[PDB]
Amino acid sequence: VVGGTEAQRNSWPSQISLQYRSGSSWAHTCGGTLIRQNWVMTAAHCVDRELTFRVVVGEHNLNQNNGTEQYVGVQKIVVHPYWNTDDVAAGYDIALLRLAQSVTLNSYVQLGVLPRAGTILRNNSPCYITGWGLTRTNGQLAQTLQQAYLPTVDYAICSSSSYWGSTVKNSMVCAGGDGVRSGCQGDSGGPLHCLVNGQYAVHGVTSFVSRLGCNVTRKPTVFTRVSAYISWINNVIASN
Ligand SMILES: [Ca+2]
């Protein structure tokens, strides 16, 4: 998250840290959203590599014990059947992870609230992206969970020539693009929390940013639109 601020310890309990094993240590690679005690929603490109992944819930500072973390292995990885690694712009950048064991829910570990199927946000809707991603284009991961206010940019505006054009699809949510604030590598798979009817709901799964950089003016951060995959998500959980 570029241009973000440190999130309060208990502000986003559905946020998880997706890490991969590197030698005798673990490294954070992506964010995710706990949607079931034993299911995590994340981006498909996050689990493209043939790595050993673990999920960490109740996490705040990646380099020191917070006394609230729960570490659990990933038992099954269900990537959307239409996901294509060489085509993030096509969409379908979403995956569900079945945890080896159900995590305990508390003040720091809660199931993310998902929006009703088909729900689209009005232009300039209030949202916050959260994650441990780079704090600067080509920079380094944040030690503590960060958050950035990224108002949405409706499809009409986002799919225009001045913005993302046809690169952005209707199955995606755009947010930010003010040149200062945005998601960045490491935030991928994480949530875009948007305020609707007084309640925050995870409307997006961080997918991509401009190859020119993370915080690029008129190149808002693009997220997989969660409301387009409600049936897909229910189907997977109901058969796994
Ligand atoms: Ca920690």
Side-chain angles (χ1 to χ4, degrees), residues 1-48 50-115 117-121 123-240:
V1 181
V2 189
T5 56
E6 187 175 307
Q8 182 181 305
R9 191 170 298 286
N10 59 355
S11 289
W12 319 102
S14 66
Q15 168 87 61
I16 68 86
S17 175
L18 179 60
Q19 325 186 321
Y20 67 85
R21 184 172 58 65
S22 176
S24 302
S25 55
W26 296 85
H28 165 94
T29 184
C30 283
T33 301
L34 185 72
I35 59 175
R36 286 293 189 291
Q37 282 191 285
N38 66 322
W39 285 99
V40 164
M41 176 180 63
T42 185
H45 76 268
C46 283
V47 291
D48 271 330
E50 311 279 355
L51 309 174
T52 289
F53 300 92
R54 80 167 173 185
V55 161
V56 184
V57 297
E59 178 56 293
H60 186 67
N61 187 314
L62 297 176
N63 302 96
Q64 67 175 184
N65 174 49
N66 292 106
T68 60
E69 312 84 322
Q70 289 181 57
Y71 309 77
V72 61
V74 176
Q75 183 167 60
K76 185 172 185 178
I77 295 180
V78 187
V79 173
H80 189 292
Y82 272 8
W83 166 243
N84 170 22
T85 313
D86 319 320
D87 196 354
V88 69
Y92 306 102
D93 194 4
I94 189 170
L96 290 186
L97 319 178
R98 191 171 67 192
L99 311 182
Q101 57 262 335
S102 303
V103 300
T104 298
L105 305 180
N106 51 47
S107 172
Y108 309 84
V109 185
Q110 293 285 307
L111 304 186
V113 175
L114 305 195
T119 311
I120 304 287
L121 299 165
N123 182 68
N124 215 48
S125 290
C127 308
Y128 280 96
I129 183 174
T130 57
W132 290 273
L134 307 189
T135 58
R136 292 207 66 173
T137 293
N138 294 312
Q140 70 190 303
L141 303 172
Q143 294 215 310
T144 60
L145 186 63
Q146 302 287 298
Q147 66 178 50
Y149 187 64
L150 301 187
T152 66
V153 180
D154 66 35
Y155 180 66
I157 296 179
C158 200
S159 70
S160 70
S161 68
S162 182
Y163 289 66
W164 280 103
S166 58
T167 301
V168 161
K169 307 298 179 290
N170 181 59
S171 62
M172 301 169 192
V173 175
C174 299
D178 72 0
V180 180
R181 295 179 286 194
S182 78
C184 210
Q185 283 64 36
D187 293 320
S188 307
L192 174 65
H193 312 271
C194 303
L195 181 64
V196 177
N197 291 148
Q199 179 196 57
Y200 277 93
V202 174
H203 281 254
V205 174
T206 310
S207 184
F208 63 93
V209 294
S210 160
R211 276 194 288 104
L212 286 182
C214 289
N215 57 303
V216 169
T217 297
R218 291 195 176 192
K219 278 295 174 299
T221 305
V222 185
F223 310 78
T224 296
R225 179 162 63 74
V226 182
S227 68
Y229 298 81
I230 298 301
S231 289
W232 181 72
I233 293 168
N234 289 334
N235 285 168
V236 177
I237 297 180
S239 46
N240 292 294

